[PDB]
Design a protein around this ligand. Structure first.
Ligand code: QJL
Ligand code: QJL
Lengths: 301, 305
């Protein structure tokens, strides 16, 4: 019993964190096999932040301009290349702690663990989700760039995020491990803003199923709803549309609790209309949307 | 920016998790140097748990009855002893991944990271607080026993908790690494209940300071209060008493934000008597009490391990 926001154990990623220094800039790198991945903005100066020409800046760099430190050991850079917004520094040593890994690009609503790092040293691990507006609500200070987001499948680390920047509202933007930004963001200091964020409806429903599995039933009602009527209501509360894919995804939790998805949707509509009235669900006074249907099943069963 | 419930990096503890099997029971063990620590209830059967005489049950066990597995490698048990509610299995191999460590007993209100394990394999890490009623609001399924709670100070792991059981309300009970239970709990299948819990006041204040550091100031007011008047109001809402020690520990956050501790106490008093009024603090509609003043400073300044 109990339901917590739970991150994956970070050990497999900790053994991959290194410090990358280029001139006066120091950030984090991910050392896998003989390659160190890091945000390409590490090559930028104060004059190259508004409109950097990364191809032009990178061509002017030599391998010895990149200082890579793994623990108290300096790694030797023997090559450098850019893949989208990620810099790939070929090093002369394969990381002996390289876990079984994959690079995966995730979709909004997906969750992942973040290992926040400074100077190539892990500071903390937390859980978050890719917001529908493609930002993440992280906890990151200056120097956290290059910190990664991941999930673990048995003994395989799926890297899904690398931190690049903080937007004016305090939310965070980054890329997958192929350097493709999530969202319409660019690695420039040009005015950028996160779009209006919405609540991840399928995740709220999964969390209501987690509450039922944990014995919390006060919010259930005798009603059901059509999928279209639910979306019409949910949209008015800035909730993401619930698709038939989402309804299908919730099938196993629906079977386990005996509450049809559209029956749970009617409970969610009622919660949106009434609020909680001094009550809580799984220790929260707000509807939680950073647990996926997969997270709920994993944590409960 | 941002404020998250953040656990310590779990790597140093992951390299210590092993699976301990005794008869039909399988749970987790903590392998440090040449000793595997685990809950002594691993030696119990269904009948035993009802009224166990652990000295009597343990004397009947031989070293070969305990199957210890570290990864896909079986460790050899060469001795066994009991220290309070923890079983200590001496093994022939010292854990090469043993970090710098200490065993520490924490106080209620102190937070720690839990590495939840099943079959000696880490499944997740979460941060929690030792409740004033000595339970933890954890997330554990059957097989999680032996999972540990820890903090990190520089490169030293301080082990503070080992999971033993789940109470009828779904909250959790366990011991320090010396086998002493936190709270009035015993390791037996008998009627036990968590006492009425209270809110960790010093932690709520620390979290209000974290909200201010992050730009959330709506709850601040022009008022201050005496420590005694605040404690009188705190008693009413089932909040823990705020001591002068707590006021002192909040000193650095008070200096950083420019809000005296008793000034923040007057904000907390108003939040208690009047509520949030539809507003949230750090994305929460409830006052969060599972961040200590040290956690807030560590997160808002970026301390690394
Ligand atoms: C040193 N400087 C030349 C480069 C640099 O490190 N820039 C990093 C920077 C950025 O967003 N950094 C940060 C990241 N996460 C959390 C933060 C919390 C507080 C302050 C900064 C934070 C700052 C300037 O705005 C941009 C704009 C585009 C991009 Cl991709 C990055 C950035
Ligand atoms: C029965 N026994 C030989 C094996 C066993 O399962 N013992 C463990 C047990 C216990 O509390 N287990 C659990 C721990 N954490 C989370 C759980 C979630 C769901 C179900 C069980 C959970 C079972 C119940 O009763 C007691 C009572 C005293 C103590 Cl110290 C332990 C136990």
């Amino acid at each position: 019993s109990g339901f917590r926001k739970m991150a994956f154990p970070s050990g497999k990623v900790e053994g991959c964190m290194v410090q990358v220094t280029c001139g006066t800039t120091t950030l984090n790198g991910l050392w896998l096999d003989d390659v160190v991945y890091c945000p390409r903005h590490v090559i930028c100066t104060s004059e190259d932040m508004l409109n950097p020409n990364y191809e032009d800046l990178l061509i002017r760099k030599s391998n010895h301009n990149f200082l890579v430190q793994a623990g108290n050991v300096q790694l030797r850079v023997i090559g450098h290349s850019m893949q989208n917004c990620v810099l790939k520094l070929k090093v002369d040593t394969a990381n002996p702690k390289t876990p079984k890994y994959k690079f995966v690009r995730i979709q909004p609503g997906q969750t992942f663990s973040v290992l926040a790092c400074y100077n190539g040293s892990p500071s903390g691990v937390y859980q978050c989700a890719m917001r529908p507006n493609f930002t993440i609500k992280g906890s990151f200070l200056n120097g956290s760039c290059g910190s990664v987001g991941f999930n673990i499948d048995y003994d395989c680390v799926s890297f899904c995020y690398m931190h690049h920047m903080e937007l004016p509202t305090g939310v965070h933007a980054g890329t997958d491990l192929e350097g493709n930004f999530y969202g319409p963001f660019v690695d420039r200091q040009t005015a950028q803003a996160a779009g209006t964020d919405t609540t991840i409806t399928v995740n709220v429903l999964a969390w209501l199923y987690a509450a039922v599995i944990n014995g919390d039933r006060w919010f259930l009602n005798r009603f059901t709803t059509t999928l279209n009527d639910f979306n019409l209501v949910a949209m008015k509360y800035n909730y993401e549309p619930l698709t038939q894919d989402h309804v299908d995804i919730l099938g196993p939790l629906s079977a386990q609790t005996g509450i049809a998805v559209l029956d749970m949707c009617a409970s969610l509509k009622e919660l949106l209309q009434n609020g909680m009235n001094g009550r809580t669900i799984l220790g929260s006074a707000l509807l939680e949307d950073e647990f996926t249907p997969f997270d709920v099943v994993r944590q409960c069963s």
